[PDB]
Amino acid sequence: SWEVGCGAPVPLVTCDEQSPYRTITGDCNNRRSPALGAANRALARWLPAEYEDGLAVPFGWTQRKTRNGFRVPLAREVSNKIVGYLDEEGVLDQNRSLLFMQWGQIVDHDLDFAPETELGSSEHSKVQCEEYCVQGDECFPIMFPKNDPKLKTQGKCMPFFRAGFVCPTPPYQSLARDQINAVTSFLDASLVYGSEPSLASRLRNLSSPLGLMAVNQEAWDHGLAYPPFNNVKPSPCEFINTTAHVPCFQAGDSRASEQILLATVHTLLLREHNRLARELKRLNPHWDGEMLYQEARKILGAFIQIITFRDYLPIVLGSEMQKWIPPYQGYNNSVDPRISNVFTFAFRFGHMEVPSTVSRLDENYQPWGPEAELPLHTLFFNTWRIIKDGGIDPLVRGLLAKNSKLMNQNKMVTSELRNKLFQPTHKVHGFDLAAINLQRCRDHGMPGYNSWRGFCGLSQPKTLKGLQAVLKNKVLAKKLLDLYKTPDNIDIWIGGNAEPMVERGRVGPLLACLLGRQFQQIRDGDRFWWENPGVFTEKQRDSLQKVSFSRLICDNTHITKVPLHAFQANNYPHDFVDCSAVDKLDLSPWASREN
């Protein structure tokens, strides 16, 4: 097949072609095909899309239309029967800090975003979907099954709107609908700087030639910076607290304030850029603002890349790490660096790592105040708890000293997310992320579980007994075929997450393959990979070699006590050292001599 380049893409892109820095949009990374990995293009299709009409209509759209002879089960019913659980006791990951979960969200937000279609500014279908749960066009409501408690308290459905797609916004009819990735596929700190020129500029402080990112002028964190407020209304952060009237933050990625710990991590990264830009000024007084910004940006990008590939991915992929992401061999322009559609669901393994509560901890890493621990749901789009309740330091301590939730075949997604999710423009803490995920899978025309099993060279269970063996769980496999009459129909998100975890990892074989291939690609096909010869000097690379999330915390908060290995489960005071013991980023090799 179909047009090799479908329209509706801004075409005003010229490549500098010698520029030592990334573009904001990701264009110009690949010299032979400059659009590859650029934001606001179609997600890559590793396999042909599968829609009930072969083109755009999701499986589950037409009641009579089956998938492989069987009706697909309601997303909310799969959620109720499989994904939910009551007892939060014993669910915590004994050897992963809460930061392990949080870094996952960060890296996802750097890589992909498929926003809901708009097409209704004065839109009343925004209410026709909300109010009356009537399916049509981009309204694809998540209907409650019979016996669902939400049917008694929340009406007939949860509203759900189909993801935006390429070229025209209005549906096309000859080639399979392609969803948009609104951010750059390259791991390049686009969640900090934006993926659009329009946003990247607003985020910058262009009042002073210091190459700084703009900061909050209203509020301060004991002399430390907050991100600026997004002053546009209606704002969901103001909504969740009428009295507080504290807006969401404004970051390079719009999702930054979805939960307090994500906002917290965005705060750390913004602080890091300004910290870096200041040092780069001392070393190079002659560098103008643009050079400073670009050079600090480039450093942070390297930081994110190294933390992700050196510290994070090995403890996600475990034994599969080396199988899918071998040691680096240089840049390869034949590699497609685009995030695939399926990856955006594969990376949602993180949803089962999120615990039910968030804690604030004082300087002895003990409960900060009388309500130190809070239910996760009271922290969706919550910025006031940061500004009016002790800044980000007590939250960072929690990130270090508390555990991620462990994925559990019996206890998949906490009810803080599965029953009490809050969504913007929507008013209640009554949504289901798991149901959303499944509905979204179908929205995006995902091939089924077995198609992806085949993709990864894995066996394709056809019977209850084959599925029991694959999952090593009789009860779970029974529930899955009871709902999906065949493992061919099992939505990839639940299928992949249902598999037991690989040795030393936190995902199954199917996911490790989908994640592994993707991360291998975003590295190998990134012309500005930090370790690609020429991007940095060798001396610079030696300096970057010693970055640590521990150091990031020390440099950018008033925390003085940190663990060496921030992602493993660390207990205070034993596993914690003084910041003085922690390697620092030696910026001296960035000194640029004139004469």
Ligand X SMILES: *[C@@H]1O[C@H](CO)[C@@H](O[C@@H]2O[C@H](CO)[C@@H](O)[C@H](O)[C@H]2NC(C)=O)[C@H](O)[C@H]1NC(C)=O
Ligand Y SMILES: NC(=O)c1cnccn1
Ligand Z SMILES: *[C@@H]1O[C@H](CO)[C@@H](O)[C@H](O)[C@H]1NC(C)=O
Instruction: Indicate if the alpha-carbon torsion angle 588, 590, 591, 595 is positive or negative.
Output: positive
Residue with structure tokens 């994904």?
83
Between 433 and 547, whose beta carbon lies closer to ligand HEM?
Answer: 433
Which DSSP category does 349 fall into? G
What are 437's two structure tokens?
């995920």
What are 205's two structure tokens?
């402080």
Task: Give the binding-site size for ligand HEM (rule: CB under 6 A).
Answer: 19
Between 190 and 570, whose beta carbon lies closer to ligand Z?
Answer: 570
Is 241 a binder of ligand X (CB under 6 A)?
yes
What is the closest distance, in whole angstroms, from the C-beta atom of residue 106 to ligand Y in the complex? Answer: 9
Is 254 a binder of ligand Y (CB under 6 A)?
yes
Helix (H) or strand (E) holding 181: strand 180-181
Q: How far is CA 534 from CA 222, 371, 552, in A?
A: 40, 51, 25
The answer to whether 224 and 368 have CB atoms below 8 angstroms apart is no
Residue with smallest beta-carbon separation from Ca ion:
190
What is the closest distance, in whole angstroms, from the C-beta atom of residue 215 to ligand X in the complex? Answer: 4
Q: Can you say whether residue 405 is alpha, beta or left, with left for phi > 0 and alpha for psi between -120 and 50 degrees?
A: beta
The site partner of 184 among Zn ion, ligand Y, Ca ion, none (C-beta below 5 to 8 Å per kind) is Ca ion
Is 558 a binder of Zn ion (CB under 5 A)?
yes
Instruction: Give the integer Cα–Cα distance in Å for 364 and 214.
Output: 33
Is 315 a binder of ligand Z (CB under 6 A)?
yes
Which DSSP category does 206 fall into? -
The answer to whether 590 and 280 have CB atoms below 8 angstroms apart is yes
Amino acid at 478: K
Between 388 and 465, whose beta carbon lies closer to ligand X?
Answer: 388
What is the closest distance, in whole angstroms, from the C-beta atom of residue 330 to ligand Z in the complex? Answer: 8
Q: Can you say whether residue 472 is alpha, beta or left, with left for phi > 0 and alpha for psi between -120 and 50 degrees?
A: left
Instruction: Give the integer Cα–Cα distance in Å for 491 and 143.
Output: 17
The answer to whether 343 and 101 have CB atoms below 8 angstroms apart is no
The site partner of 350 among ligand HEM, Ca ion, ligand X, none (C-beta below 5 to 8 Å per kind) is ligand HEM
Report whether 542 belongs to an annotated binding site: no
Is 224 a binder of ligand X (CB under 6 A)?
no
Report whether 188 belongs to an annotated binding site: yes
Between 348 and 527, whose beta carbon lies closer to ligand HEM?
Answer: 348
Binding mask 109-138 for ligand Y (x = CB under 6 A): x-----------------------------
What is the closest distance, in whole angstroms, from the C-beta atom of residue 185 to Ca ion in the complex? Answer: 6
Report whether 108 belongs to an annotated binding site: yes
Candidate residues 9, 46, 66, 95; the one interacting with ligand Z per rule CB under 6 A: 95
Instruction: Give the integer Cα–Cα distance in Å for 60 and 52.
Output: 8
How many CB atoms neighbour CB 374 within 10 A?
Answer: 17
403: phi then psi, degrees, rounded to nearest 5? -100, 150
Partners of 51 in beta bridges = none
Is 108 a binder of ligand Y (CB under 6 A)?
yes
Instruction: Give the integer Cα–Cα distance in Å for 557 and 140.
Output: 44
* Residues in 173-212 that interact with Ca ion by CB under 5 A: 184, 188, 190
Instruction: Give the integer Cα–Cα distance in Å for 128 and 130.
Output: 6
The site partner of 315 among ligand HEM, Zn ion, ligand Z, none (C-beta below 5 to 8 Å per kind) is ligand Z
Cis peptide upstream of residue 500 (ω within 30 degrees of 0)? no
* Residues in 330-349 that interact with ligand Z by CB under 6 A: 332, 334-335
Amino acid at 525: G
| The one catalytic residue among 109, 273, 377, 444 | 109
The answer to whether 236 and 248 have CB atoms below 8 angstroms apart is yes
Is 344 a binder of ligand HEM (CB under 6 A)?
yes
Query: Is residue 429 annotated as a catalytic residue, yes or no?
Result: no
Per CB under 6 A, the segment of 70-78, 344-352, 454-462, 531-539 that binds ligand HEM is 344-352
* Residues in 215-244 that interact with Zn ion by CB under 5 A: 222
* Residues in 250-309 that interact with ligand HEM by CB under 6 A: 258-259
Instruction: Give the integer Cα–Cα distance in Å for 416 and 393.
Output: 23
Q: How far is CA 487 from CA 145, 226, 229, 318, 515, in A?
A: 21, 48, 47, 26, 21
What is the closest distance, in whole angstroms, from the C-beta atom of residue 222 to Zn ion in the complex? Answer: 3
The SS3 call for residue 522 is: helix
Per CB under 6 A, the segment of 13-21, 217-225, 328-336, 555-563 that binds ligand Z is 328-336
Per CB under 6 A, the segment of 77-85, 102-110, 275-283, 329-337 that binds ligand Z is 329-337
Q: Which residues are catalytic?
A: 109
Where is the binding site for heme b, in residues? Answer: 108, 258, 351
Q: Which residues bind ligand Z (CB under 6 A)?
A: 95, 315, 332, 334-335, 568
Q: Which residues bind ligand Y (CB under 6 A)?
A: 105, 108-109, 254-255, 258, 423-424
Q: Which residues bind ligand HEM (CB under 6 A)?
A: 101, 104-105, 108, 112-114, 258-259, 344, 347-348, 350-351, 353-354, 433, 436, 440
Where is the binding site, in residues? Answer: 108, 110, 184, 186, 188, 190, 258, 351
Q: Which residues bind ligand X (CB under 6 A)?
A: 205, 207-208, 210, 212, 214-215, 217, 241, 243-244, 384, 388
